[PDB]
Write a protein that binds this ligand. Structure first.
Ligand SMILES: CCCOc1ccc(C[C@H](CC)C(=O)O)cc1CNC(=O)c1ccc([C@]23C[C@H]4C[C@H](C[C@H](C4)C2)C3)cc1
Ligand SMILES: CCCOc1ccc(C[C@H](CC)C(=O)O)cc1CNC(=O)c1ccc([C@]23C[C@H]4C[C@H](C[C@H](C4)C2)C3)cc1
Lengths: 264, 264
């Protein structure tokens, strides 16, 4: 229909407006020039140029793995803010009760975060720092436990997600569908949320049919990736709690503490 | 030994990484929510939601039994690709000659496919479409010949296979052992393949000893299931050839035609 094509276009435009990075942009950068972080020397060089304040403390600088963990948190706080603006484009979201908006975003943001991380990842590493660096998967594996274990499951997911060959017009609807999940704990007006979700999923189904006529299973494949993301986030939150208990230098931003609070 | 436990763990991890469905995941879904296909009404409903493109042709849509047969083929092409990636974890496989890799996979994929189908089957039906549907065994029996005869022998095998109560750590090694069969026709370097097979079977034997101390016959039982699978695949290929000759609408994907070509 014309109102459903317009809805898919609205969501896509709200996605291009609100996220500083998208798959088209990331792929152009990755083709090639981003500075390569592949070892401890190049990490320290990239820090001095790209996050100078974080390493301006001399011997009082944190352990490298803790600095990296802090940078990862900074990007999540940014993406949570972008995701919050993006959600207003979803028909009905801005009409929901404020508390329900908080709940849907609370459980959705990290699913959306790791879904969109796939856009900047390849089998060798990931684009980072607003397109200005490329950090290798092998370097992230070289970080001492438990910090290396944060990274590799995200690459594992992203490689399978990227094999679906989604574009930005697909991913925007997928992120909307993530936010609209009506089975989140503590929702007040579940019935209105289910109707909101039905609408986005309806548009997503039709969009994948027209945009990917070569893969007749892409919609159920993406439904399964939503479940995989929910499990990926549950496991992530557990590793973060381990880091919180065992690593006194790895302070969690208060905004992210609130997201994790009473999640898993 | 430590290198043999590590090998069993490597194979298991490569299995969890490369197959989108496993027994743990399937059982959780089957406990309960997948949409139930139990009659012609619910088949057509599931098609419109889950493979919309396949039924978007109006009166030019294929007969229901042919649509189902087409979906089954699509999943085999997917599993053949996953199986090909999985095989690289088997010590020595990636070192074999390219032609031998093709031959081992040619004869192994359908044995592995029907072995792993058991994980998503119970006595009443099977999980389908990336965990999003459940199609009943009785509905598949209701399909006109010859299409109903594709389905029931797979349930018969799976019920006996599932009574062995294997878990994913067992099945991963079993699928590796299937791929390593050194008596496939046309192998070039049979001696190297026999040593590769000996290694996987050695690890499988020791793994079943520790993981199933209650069933002292489980290893010979699984050897017999490998022979049963070879016969199941031979009979499957014969029914597929009948369908190829007698059903002009049931086109075989070219990749699967090549697998069947000069098999039985
Ligand atoms: C394998 C996936 C790694 O990325 C991850 C992983 C987990 C998370 C979630 C975080 C974990 C603390 C969260 O729970 O909020 C976020 C990112 C996203 N990380 C980033 O966007 C990121 C951004 C900048 C950097 C830097 C690190 C160094 C080197 C280089 C310049 C500068 C200093 C920033 C890249 C690193 C990661
Ligand atoms: C009793 C066993 C039935 O399953 C079989 C049987 C044989 C084979 C081998 C195939 C036969 C053509 C081959 O030779 O490659 C594969 C499967 C695996 N089939 C599937 O994975 C499958 C996937 C999706 C569906 C659908 C069919 C309808 C209903 C529902 C949604 C949508 C449309 C997909 C499930 C059905 C079967």
């Amino acid at each position: 229909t014309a109102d459903l094509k317009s809805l898919a276009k609205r969501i896509y435009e709200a996605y291009l407006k609100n996220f500083n990075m998208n798959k088209v942009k990331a792929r152009v950068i990755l083709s090639g020039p981003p500075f390569v972080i592949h070892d401890m020397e190049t990490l320290c060089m990239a820090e001095k140029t790209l996050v100078a304040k974080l390493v301006a403390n001399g011997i009082q600088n944190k352990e490298a793995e803790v600095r990296i963990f802090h940078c990862c948190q900074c990007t999540s706080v940014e993406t949570v803010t972008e995701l919050t603006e993006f959600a207003k484009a979803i028909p009905g979201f801005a009409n929901l009760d404020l508390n329900d908006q908080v709940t849907l975003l609370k459980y959705g943001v990290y699913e959306a975060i790791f879904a969109m991380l796939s856009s900047v990842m390849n089998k060798d590493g990931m684009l980072v720092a607003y397109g200005n660096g490329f950090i290798t998967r092998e370097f992230l594996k070289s970080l001492r436990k438990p910090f290396c274990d944060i990274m590799e499951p995200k690459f594992d997911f992203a490689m399978k997600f990227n094999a679906l060959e989604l574009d930005d017009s697909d991913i925007s609807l997928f992120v909307a569908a993530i936010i609209c999940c009506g089975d989140r704990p503590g929702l007040l007006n579940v019935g209105h949320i289910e109707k909101m979700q039905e609408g986005i999923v309806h548009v997503l189904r039709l969009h994948l049919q027209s945009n990917h006529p070569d893969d007749i299973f892409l919609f159920p494949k993406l439904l399964q990736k939503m479940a995989d993301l929910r499990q990926l986030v549950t496991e992530h939150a557990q590793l973060v709690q381990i880091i919180k208990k065992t690593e006194s230098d790895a302070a969690l931003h208060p905004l992210l503490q609130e997201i994790y609070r009473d999640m898993y």
